[PDB]
Amino acid sequence: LREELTLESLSNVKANSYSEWITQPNVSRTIARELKSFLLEYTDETGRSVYGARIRTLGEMNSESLEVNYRHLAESKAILALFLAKCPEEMLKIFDLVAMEATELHYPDYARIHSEIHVRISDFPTIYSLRELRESNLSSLVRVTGVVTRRTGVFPQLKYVKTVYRNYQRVTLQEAPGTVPPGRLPRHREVILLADLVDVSKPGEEVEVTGIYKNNYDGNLNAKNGFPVFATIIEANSIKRSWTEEEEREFRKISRDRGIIDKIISSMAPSIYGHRDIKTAVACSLFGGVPKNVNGKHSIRGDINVLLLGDPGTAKSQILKYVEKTAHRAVFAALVLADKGVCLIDEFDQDRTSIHEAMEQQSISISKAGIVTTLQARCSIIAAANPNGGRYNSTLPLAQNVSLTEPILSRFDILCVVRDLVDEEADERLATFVVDSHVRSHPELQRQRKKEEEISPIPQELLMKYIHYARTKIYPKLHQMDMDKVSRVYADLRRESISTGSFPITVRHLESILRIAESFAKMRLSEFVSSYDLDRAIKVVVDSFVDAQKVSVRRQLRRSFAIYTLGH
Amino acid sequence: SDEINELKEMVKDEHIYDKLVRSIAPAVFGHEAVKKGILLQMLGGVHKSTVEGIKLRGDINICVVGDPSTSKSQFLKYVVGFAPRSVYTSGKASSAAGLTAAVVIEAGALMLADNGICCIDEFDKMDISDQVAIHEAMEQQTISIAKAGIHATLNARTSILAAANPVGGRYNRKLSLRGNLNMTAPIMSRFDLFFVILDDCNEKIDTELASHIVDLHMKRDEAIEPPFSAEQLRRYIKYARTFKPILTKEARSYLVEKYKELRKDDASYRITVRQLESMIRLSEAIARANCVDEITPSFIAEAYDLLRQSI
Amino acid sequence: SPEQTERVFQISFFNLPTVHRIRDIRSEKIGSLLSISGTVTRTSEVRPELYKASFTCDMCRAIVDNVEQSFKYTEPTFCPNPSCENRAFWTLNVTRSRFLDWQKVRIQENANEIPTGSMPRTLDVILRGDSVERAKPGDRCKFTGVEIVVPDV
DNA sequence: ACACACTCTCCAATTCTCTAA
DNA sequence: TTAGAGAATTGGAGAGTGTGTTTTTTTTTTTTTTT
Numbered sequence A: 001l002r003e004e005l006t007l008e009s010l011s012n013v014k015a016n017s018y019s020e021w022i023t024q025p026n027v028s029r030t031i032a033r034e035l036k037s038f039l040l041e042y043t044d045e046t047g048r049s050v051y052g053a054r055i056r057t058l059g060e061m062n063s064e065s066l067e068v069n070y071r072h073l074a075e076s077k078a079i080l081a082l083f084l085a086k087c088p089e090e091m092l093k094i095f096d097l098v099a100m101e102a103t104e105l106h107y108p109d110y111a112r113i114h115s116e117i118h119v120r121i122s123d124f125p126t127i128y129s130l131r132e133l134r135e136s137n138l139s140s141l142v143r144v145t146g147v148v149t150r151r152t153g154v155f156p157q158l159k160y161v162k163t164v165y166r167n168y169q170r171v172t173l174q175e176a177p178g179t180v181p182p183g184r185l186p187r188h189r190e191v192i193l194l195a196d197l198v199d200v201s202k203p204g205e206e207v208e209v210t211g212i213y214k215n216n217y218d219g220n221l222n223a224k225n226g227f228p229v230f231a232t233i234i235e236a237n238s239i240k241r242s243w244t245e246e247e248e249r250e251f252r253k254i255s256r257d258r259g260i261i262d263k264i265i266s267s268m269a270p271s272i273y274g275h276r277d278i279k280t281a282v283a284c285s286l287f288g289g290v291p292k293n294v295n296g297k298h299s300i301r302g303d304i305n306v307l308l309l310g311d312p313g314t315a316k317s318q319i320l321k322y323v324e325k326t327a328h329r330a331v332f333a334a335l336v337l338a339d340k341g342v343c344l345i346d347e348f349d350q351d352r353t354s355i356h357e358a359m360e361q362q363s364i365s366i367s368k369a370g371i372v373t374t375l376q377a378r379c380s381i382i383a384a385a386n387p388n389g390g391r392y393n394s395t396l397p398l399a400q401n402v403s404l405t406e407p408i409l410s411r412f413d414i415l416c417v418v419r420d421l422v423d424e425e426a427d428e429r430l431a432t433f434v435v436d437s438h439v440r441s442h443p444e445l446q447r448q449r450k451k452e453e454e455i456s457p458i459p460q461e462l463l464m465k466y467i468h469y470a471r472t473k474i475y476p477k478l479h480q481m482d483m484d485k486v487s488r489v490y491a492d493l494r495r496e497s498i499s500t501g502s503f504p505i506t507v508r509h510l511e512s513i514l515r516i517a518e519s520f521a522k523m524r525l526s527e528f529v530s531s532y533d534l535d536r537a538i539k540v541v542v543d544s545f546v547d548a549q550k551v552s553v554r555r556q557l558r559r560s561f562a563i564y565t566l567g568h
Numbered sequence B: 001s002d003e004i005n006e007l008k009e010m011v012k013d014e015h016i017y018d019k020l021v022r023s024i025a026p027a028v029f030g031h032e033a034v035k036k037g038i039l040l041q042m043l044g045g046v047h048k049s050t051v052e053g054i055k056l057r058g059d060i061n062i063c064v065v066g067d068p069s070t071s072k073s074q075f076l077k078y079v080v081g082f083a084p085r086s087v088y089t090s091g092k093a094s095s096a097a098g099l100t101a102a103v104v105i106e107a108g109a110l111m112l113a114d115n116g117i118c119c120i121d122e123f124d125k126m127d128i129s130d131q132v133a134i135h136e137a138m139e140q141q142t143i144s145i146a147k148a149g150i151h152a153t154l155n156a157r158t159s160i161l162a163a164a165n166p167v168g169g170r171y172n173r174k175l176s177l178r179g180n181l182n183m184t185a186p187i188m189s190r191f192d193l194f195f196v197i198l199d200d201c202n203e204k205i206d207t208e209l210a211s212h213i214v215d216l217h218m219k220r221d222e223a224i225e226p227p228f229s230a231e232q233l234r235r236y237i238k239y240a241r242t243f244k245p246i247l248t249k250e251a252r253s254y255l256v257e258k259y260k261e262l263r264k265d266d267a268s269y270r271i272t273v274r275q276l277e278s279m280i281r282l283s284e285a286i287a288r289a290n291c292v293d294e295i296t297p298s299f300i301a302e303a304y305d306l307l308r309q310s311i
Numbered sequence C: 001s002p003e004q005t006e007r008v009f010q011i012s013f014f015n016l017p018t019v020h021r022i023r024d025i026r027s028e029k030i031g032s033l034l035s036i037s038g039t040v041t042r043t044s045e046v047r048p049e050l051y052k053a054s055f056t057c058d059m060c061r062a063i064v065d066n067v068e069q070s071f072k073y074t075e076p077t078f079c080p081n082p083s084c085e086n087r088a089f090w091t092l093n094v095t096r097s098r099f100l101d102w103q104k105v106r107i108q109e110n111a112n113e114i115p116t117g118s119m120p121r122t123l124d125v126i127l128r129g130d131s132v133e134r135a136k137p138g139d140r141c142k143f144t145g146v147e148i149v150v151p152d153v
Numbered sequence D: 001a002c003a004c005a006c007t008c009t010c011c012a013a014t015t016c017t018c019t020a021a
Numbered sequence E: 001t002t003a004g005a006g007a008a009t010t011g012g013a014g015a016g017t018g019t020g021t022t023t024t025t026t027t028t029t030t031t032t033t034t035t
């Protein structure tokens, strides 16, 4: 009762098992005193007691979970770490009851905010996949990794058996495909999430879990297998998966330099040679414009949509894979998952019908059995296609080379055609670059730095951070001076289109020009569009419009349009 | 120790490459080109990836086209009877579910052939609805399942060996291979090598071929007399696959010249950048066959010469 | 350290005189020592099997130990303390009880051995201890052990 | 309401013991 | 040494009580509308 053990007295487990030793009153009181003495006293090398600084922020966020690193608990009072690894279900009860004392020392009457606090363990120093688990692991703490395959809804559950409840949710976890050995199927396990941990993860995420490994009787398993076979589950204890002023100043430094637009385009898709216009269009789509709306009868999207007609093997699928790794959020082939992101299509009636609705709208609506509901698309579409068989025909307009309705070609902001042209010098350049890249990739720090800086003019980590910063912070606008010239150019282009008997230029093209100019302003972190932005946007759209036409019309257009496609 | 001694003895030989080619499929008369292709597929290239995280395919796909009685199925029968990881499947009597994977989840043929050779016989009889499944798997070396609330992704690092019939049963020398073969252009674009077999009637060949066939029916084991034992050859192939050779400087200079020659011949299936990548794979396999850690330019001359027989 | 439980040794045999086919399993050989061969077609995940059990009474502080299971989950017949008669509300002490690793696998006849006009038969095999996850689907294997008979639990 | 599983209770069949002829 | 009168222990007859029951493929032959 009154007397307490020394820490050295705990070195000898005196009962027949660990659990029956931890649960004794004098041992338990000793452990409680020692844990409280650790939590009030552990330090950085700089002093600066970390847990006194964490409890402080627990109340600043009105939170419920205190987080403890295992390495700190192993760095002093090692026996408590050993007992925690062996008997988590007991040790964590004592530790939670100590954590409440420590928090009330900062914030008296915190019990009125939350009645009970949970300790979360981090950095447990050994890991298993779902292969290595065996019966010896039962009731031990484990650390596991995988992909979350399926998730239930959240429900309340009765806490005690006057009443009290807690939140509950189950998650199915599967081995990551990179970990699975060759020629074997992946394994599965199911995880239980309680009060603070529900909806911490989403289906398809790759996730890391710490918790107790636990089992129970199940009648159906016994009945079907015909042997006394128990079922097992994991009870999670913790689950795992911005910028400074220095980054902002660095971004602004590079943006202040001349030619930053060209350098960003050059950094785009380093492994692919040539095809600068495709890289330009992809960069413009990833940065995008600004959305606008006028409740008097009109709305304008900020997203930029691009379509690429590809000869066989002209790098299309590689740049889509590159964009998939570059972009913040994306879908590859579902438009709900592409919300405020980029959507990627590499090959191609109901699918096309869905895309017809998606290009007309920015939000999707559906009804079924009298139910009615709505969803958001709000995304930029990058698509590629094979031109109606083995090879494109340049003598014909674009419609002859595609399996698309006319409004699709109207509503795509940018159209482009890529062809396997014949040139000895280009072939030699391609072949030299290809074998050079092949050698540079061979499995057989300084080597990496040289390789990286030869690969690109911008480090791509900085470029991804820069794209995210620009997308979240920069919102450009037009300047009202040169817009008279834009209107005159629009009228001139329409007059020339009619004069040669071309299909006419339209308001959609003018809108696309303004949107692309906004994107060009965003690329250099400029809140103003400028004359050169309008010039570049005009060149892109005019050249794209010219590429869609028949050959005789193409010659008349380029002869007249020389003062836009090349001059300004 | 005796295994190591025997392996060292055959490794030391000057004429090892020729004997290895000669020891594939002992019962089939002639057709050394296909046998060489089978050996290089069996050894394989070197798998690798770039700084960008994109992967570069390290293995070889082969297709054999021929009019009837050309013994083309004997190559598939030998391969599935020899290679440690392999499966044999007929294009008529199989389903997309049975080829990739099926809900019951249980593994299909391409899953069992992971890190192995998968044999498709009478490919031209397969339904388009299932050819596209093989195409999607071959594009990614990956298989995907999503149905009934169950989702899964699986790895399929499998090399394909296929056999097919020309349309109308006999090949037309007036026409491209695309005209002769009932196969869609994206799938055709993904075979590293195509072999076309033709009767080419000739008394001096017939008089020998008939003798060879009658000897097989007259004596069971005695006729073939191969250069090596099968259990010897498998140990050699296991040993060879441990090498990871590196491309020499002179070979890099030589490759672009040979590729320019192919492009000028092209200026028939149109020659793309993929042919250069395939040629690199074949050169890696050739160097590995010889137990050499450097790609000598002679190996690329061999690979270029072998590849142009498919055109 | 606290007390350490006993090691569950396993005896194993090999190089038996002859190998039978799945088609040669017949009820006269039940409980004898045999060896078999075939191709694997399915495998189960590893599960814990209850080997020896220990229970404690709800109505009084009493404990029962080393209860033996065989094919179905089995519990005590009396309260050992004669001051109590309750037979209900036992709980299995997971710390004091002992488990084993258990895996189910499924095999079918070798294709080259099938007789004329017939089709391949199949069989279910049990693996325990240090031999779980050794087998792989699509591979060819040789097994040895004893054939048994399982009830309708 | 209709076969079952399980619990409770009373009554007489049985064997054991003591006494005297 | 037999036997008969009285006491104690056990078995199971049978009476009673509570209970449970009805009731997304994947593969293969055939008809039908659709390009």
Ligand SMILES: Nc1ncnc2c1ncn2[C@@H]1O[C@H](COP(=O)(O)OP(=O)(O)NP(=O)(O)O)[C@@H](O)[C@H]1O
Pocket (backbone or CB within 6 Å): A271, A272, A273, A274, A310, A311, A312, A313, A314, A315, A316, A317, A318, A386, A430, A434, B186, B273, B274, B277
């Ligand atoms: N700079 C390059 N230019 C062209 N091709 C390249 C280049 N670098 C690599 N390649 C290869 O050429 C192909 C690039 O085009 P890609 O579209 O990805 O091939 P593909 O998907 O098989 N053709 P397709 O099926 O019609 O899309 C790949 O096989 C690449 O490995």
Ligand SMILES: [Mg+2]
Pocket (backbone or CB within 6 Å): A313, A315, A316, A317, A318
């Ligand atoms: Mg592609």
Ligand SMILES: [Zn+2]
Pocket (backbone or CB within 6 Å): C057, C058, C059, C060, C061, C062, C079, C080, C081, C084, C085, C086
């Ligand atoms: Zn009791």
